[model samples]
Target chain A: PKEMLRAQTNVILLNVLKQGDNYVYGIIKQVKEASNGEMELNEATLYTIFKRLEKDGIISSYWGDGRRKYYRLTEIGHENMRLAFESWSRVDKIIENLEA
Target chain B: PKEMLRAQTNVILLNVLKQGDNYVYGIIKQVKEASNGEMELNEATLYTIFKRLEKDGIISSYWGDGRRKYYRLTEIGHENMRLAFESWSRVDKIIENLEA
Candidate 1:
């Protein structure tokens, strides 16, 4: 579970931003509300990926009002997220056959 | 791809051992062969988890010959693997809903 959570963090964050921009706390809360078993994410965990994604030019961040920084996925982020979903489609089938 | 690879390694190792006992190299080779997009694993990564799973009592290991050590799943490992599949079922559904 922690393992999946780690791999999923980037794609899911892009997924949330796919709809609209959200600040760190808002992203944590929103994903919790809209997801299953709820993904437990903390600021440290998120900011780490935020740094990576922003550095990779997948996501961009800006000051919303004052201290709060909101994140929005770049076009690259959107495509990466889309491809992650597609990868899951193929992967899920193979896992089913193997694990079953 | 690499992300899924990590989360998948343990349960899949258990799946392989469920069929029969296997050594470290065999586990790595077998998983790569019978998987999708393929999961690339080296001994360092595999052994780190081998240590963890052995410590957690999820799997047990013994020598097959002189230099080769073989691993077998404990009953707990089997149940954990089964539950991982069950969790995947729930997770895949939620991911489908959100990513779409």
Candidate 2:
């Protein structure tokens, strides 16, 4: 069950970055609140994914006020997010196919 | 990206069972066909999920005529699948909350 949330965190995180620049804690809160307290992205996992995305050029970061790291999606990130959206849409059909 | 499928395999398997009894290869074929070959459930992963579900009382299994393992949902399995559907529904809203 937890893995379910863990699996979607990448999609959720990328979508979050698509909105605007956000710090780590802010990113976590955005998802939790958006999920109505149902989803919690682990602090460790968040950083790991952040590093992974940053390394992959999906996102980039810079130091902000209060010595915090803020993340924003790159152009490639937006393109990937667009692909993610299409993939999500396709998955909707895939599930429907099986369930029906 | 593949982790997405790896993660949802649980829900996918449960829903496949909701339809009717199926053997391992048939289950894999169902999902692969349903996804237009976009997804492939590894043979190892199939058994791992199978055992986990069976151990959790989510599914039960029996031998088929071909000396193969076939799985079906139990009452608890159906109940869990219902919850899975609702959870999936909630996630749809959750993602919408972020992307929009």
Candidate 3:
């Protein structure tokens, strides 16, 4: 079940990257707030997602000044966002109807 | 938001693994049904997720009795499901309320 949350993680991270480049800790912080601290991901799980996303050319990160890992969406990441959202539009409607 | 659906994927895949080992195509089929065919994952995207999940030791795959590649969740996969669901409990409630 928690593993399924990978989708949530990807979107959340991508959204944050959409906002702007920031440290990893900032991403974690924003997610906690958005989900009202419902998220329980550890550094390991979270960082692994980052690594995976980087590997797939969806997003990229680099150590900036003072060892702060700054991450931003790549060109491919933007493309992925477009395609993913297009797919989710339907899912979103379904979820909305299910809830209704 | 679509990227956020990564969580949904993780949970869905982990649950399928919970049932039994299956081939990649089977998993894709199951997800399409679960999401009412709203999921638009291509082979590349789907395979990328599988690779990442395997890299994290959450799941593993091998060629089965035939040419089919079978995958099953690891011990860690079970643990992740537990944790992910626990977290979703709260978010689910919030979504419920938001809809209400």
Candidate 4:
């Protein structure tokens, strides 16, 4: 499940970025809605992943209104998203074949 | 991806048993094929998980065909598979929504 979370952080981040820049609470809300409440990430862990992504240069964050941090994908983040989606597709295909 | 692998072990085992009783080598081969080479599990880890499953009474193994161990799912194993599949479906749905 941890590995699933790790892979999904990228997907969730990229998906949120697709709509535009977003703050932590907004991202959390969007993810909960996107996963239909299956994923309710804690703010601490979400921030940890965000910091890791920022350190890895995949994403960048800036202070927005009222001291909330807004996150957006960097160029590398977009590239990373492309690769992550491809990797995800491969796994999805395997699962599909197995389930079939 | 360790979490992914962990979740998949049960799926692979149950899927293999759905066909019939099988040995370690056969299970490995079938899983590799099912995942289309996306997953290549190590033999030691496979044996470890097999032992754990056996201990948990989810599966039973017996020696057959000159010391080769063959495995089959127990009743509990089947039950577990059903639950595992449902969990997998939820995760898959979330991924689909995120990707969509």
Measured by lDDT, the strongest candidate is 2
User: What interface RMSD does each of the candidate structures achieve?
Assistant: 3.4, 2.7, 7.5, 3.9
DockQ of 2: 0.46
lDDT value, residue A4 of candidate 1? 55
lDDT tens readout by residue for model 3, A21-94: 87778877766666667664577776888898889888888888758888889998998788766765555454
Ranking by DockQ: 2, 4, 1, 3
Q: Report residue A94 deviation for candidate 3 (angstroms).
A: 5.6
lDDT of 1 by residue, A24-86 (tens): 999888677657546667889889989988998989999976488989989888887777677
Reference-based TM-score of each model: 0.62, 0.69, 0.49, 0.64
Best by DockQ: 2
Among all candidates shown, the one with the greatest TM-score = 2
After superposition, candidate 3 runs with Cα above 4 Å error: A94-100, B1-100
Model 4 DockQ, alpha carbons vs. true complex: 0.31
- C-alpha-based local distance difference test score of model 1: 0.75
Q: Mind giving the per-residue lDDT tens digits that candidate 4 earns over B7-84? A: 556556667786688888887887799777867878888888888888989889888965888898999988877765
Q: For model 3, how does the per-residue alpha-carbon lDDT over B1-100 read when each residue is reduced to its tens digit?
A: 4545664555556777777888878877765666677664566766878898899998898997659988888998888767766765655454343333
Model 1: reference contacts kept, as a fraction: 0.11
Off by over 4 Å in 2: A25-29, A36-58, A65-68, A79-83, B8-10, B36-57, B65-68
| Of 2 and 3, the candidate ranking higher by DockQ | 2
Off by over 4 Å in 1: A1-4, A8-11, A25-29, A36-52, A63-68, A82-90, B1-4, B8-11, B18-20, B23-33, B36-52, B63-69, B79-90
lDDT against the true structure, per candidate, is 0.75, 0.82, 0.70, 0.74
User: What is candidate 2's lDDT per residue for B12-99, written digit by digit as tens?
Assistant: 7787888999988998899899999988888889898888889999899998883988899999889877776787677778879887
